[PDB]
Amino acid sequence: SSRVIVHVDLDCFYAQVEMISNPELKDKPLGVQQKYLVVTCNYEARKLGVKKLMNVRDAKEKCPQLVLVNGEDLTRYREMSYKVTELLEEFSPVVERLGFDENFVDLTEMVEKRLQQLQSDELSAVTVSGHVYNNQSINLLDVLHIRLLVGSQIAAEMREAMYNQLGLTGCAGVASNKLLAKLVSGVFKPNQQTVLLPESCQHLIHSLNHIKEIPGIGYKTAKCLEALGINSVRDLQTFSPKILEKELGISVAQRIQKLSFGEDNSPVILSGPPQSFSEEDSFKKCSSEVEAKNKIEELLASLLNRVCRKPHTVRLIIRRYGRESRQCPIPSHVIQKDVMTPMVDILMKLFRNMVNVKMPFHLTLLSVCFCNLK
DNA sequence: ATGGGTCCT
DNA sequence: AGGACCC
Numbered sequence: 001s002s003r004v005i006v007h008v009d010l011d012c013f014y015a016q017v018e019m020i021s022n023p024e025l026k027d028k029p030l031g032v033q034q035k036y037l038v039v040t041c042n043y044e045a046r047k048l049g050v051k052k053l054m055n056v057r058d059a060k061e062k063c064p065q066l067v068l069v070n071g072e073d074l075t076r077y078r079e080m081s082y083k084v085t086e087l088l089e090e091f092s093p094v095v096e097r098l099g100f101d102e103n104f105v106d107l108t109e110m111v112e113k114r115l116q117q118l119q120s121d122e123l124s125a126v127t128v129s130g131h132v133y134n135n136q137s138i139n140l141l142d143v144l145h146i147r148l149l150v151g152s153q154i155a156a157e158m159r160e161a162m163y164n165q166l167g168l169t170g171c172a173g174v175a176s177n178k179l180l181a182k183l184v185s186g187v188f189k190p191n192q193q194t195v196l197l198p199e200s201c202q203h204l205i206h207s208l209n210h211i212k213e214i215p216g217i218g219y220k221t222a223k224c225l226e227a228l229g230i231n232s233v234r235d236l237q238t239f240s241p242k243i244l245e246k247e248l249g250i251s252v253a254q255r256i257q258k259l260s261f262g263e264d265n266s267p268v269i270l271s272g273p274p275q276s277f278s279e280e281d282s283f284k285k286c287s288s289e290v291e292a293k294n295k296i297e298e299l300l301a302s303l304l305n306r307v308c309r310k311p312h313t314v315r316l317i318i319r320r321y322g323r324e325s326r327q328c329p330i331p332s333h334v335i336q337k338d339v340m341t342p343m344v345d346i347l348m349k350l351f352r353n354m355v356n357v358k359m360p361f362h363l364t365l366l367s368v369c370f371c372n373l374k
Numbered sequence: 375a376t377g378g379g380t381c382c383t
Numbered sequence: 384a385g386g387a388c389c390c
């Protein structure tokens with residue numbers, strides 16, 4: 001059965017949150033800085049050549065007028081992120097989060113409910129909200145076209161409510177599955193929306209120029225495909241399944257070749273509350289157990305505040321010089337909210353298991369994670 | 375990379 | 384405990 005899926009993608013999310021917090025930056029080029037990176041910037045800085053994940057050096061030699069705000073503490077972005085997800089869940093309860101600033105909603109039942117409430121007179125009547133991908137002609141007698149247009153109307157109500165209630169702008173894409181909704185949502189940006197009618201689906205998938213542009217094909221898989229002479233979407237569509245299975249294994253080969261044809265039967269999953277929560281810090285050097293204990297403690301204090309459901313597992317992640325980790329359960333008496341001294345004790349034991357402290361060492365990342373929430 | 379997340383093997 | 388993916 002055919003679905004109607006919406007993908008919602010907030011405009012320059014962290015920069016939006018900082019611009020709302022400080023409107024002295026609303027008319028100025030703004031970048032959100034983490035360590036030496038400009039992780040995102042407003043469309044005003046984008047005009048001046050500043051790009052996402054750009055070295056703070058290169059970004060200011062491109063835009064010497066660039067205003068920088070520190071975005072290392074994710075507290076406020078995470079809080080707004082969940083306010084958006086909760087707002088969407090009011091439209092339809094099955095909302096899938098993808099990072100902090102994207103959501104998928106399955107609108108199929110909502111669409112069918114709205115259509116069922118329309119008298120035969122007003123079927124034609126039905127109008128698109130926003131862009132139609134590839135300027136495709138609408139056929140109002142095609143029930144798939146009608147359902148996708150009602151999806152576009154719902155998407156515009158969602159964007160409006162996000163603006164009215166939270167002060168946030170964003171893009172939306174409406175299509176028959178998640179892959180296609182996520183691909184089409186970014187066609188017109190910022191703060192616009194697009195719907196994909198089914199006869200334009202080939203056009204959308206062949207508009208991609210790099211195989212890594214398909215969501216689900218990442219860094220290592222694209223390296224593999226390139227090693228095999230596979231560069232375009234069509235190369236992948238037409239490559240031998242049997243060779244592809246041999247090279248990538250049956251699961252990945254079968255999944256990505258389907259994705260190459262625009263086919264994606266994966267359900268929208270209700271994300272609900274998070275499965276883990278972690279605090280990280282990166283640095284040039286940690287060369288000391290005395291320093292490492294201080295580092296881990298600060299991460300612990302942040303997480304304990306977030307805690308206040310309970311985690312039943314704790315893990316510690318390091319990066320030397322890639323990631324290594326050690327985890328263990330959290331003792332029952334400790335799950336019962338001075339928790340600090342027995343938890344740091346647990347974590348240093350994990351640290352000592354992974355790091356030989358009697359021999360020199362050099363860390364560039366420490367991360368503590370709470371998981372296995374009950 | 376930064377500072378987070380998800381699921382699968 | 385690690386891999387792969389996503390933002």
Ligand SMILES: Nc1nc2c(ncn2[C@H]2C[C@H](O)[C@@H](COP(=O)(O)OP(=O)(O)OP(=O)(O)O)O2)c(=O)[nH]1
Binds near residue numbers: 052
């Ligand atoms: N540290 C780090 N943060 C990221 C990374 N990718 C995305 N983010 C964060 C910062 C951004 O505000 C947001 C980026 O998500 P998007 O890819 O949707 O980008 P953004 O919303 O900034 O720009 P957009 O208008 O959608 O093109 O989440 C990343 O690779 N590393």
Ligand SMILES: [Mg+2]
Binds near residue numbers: 011101
């Ligand atoms: Mg975004």
Ligand SMILES: [Mg+2]
Binds near residue numbers: 010013099101102
């Ligand atoms: Mg984002």
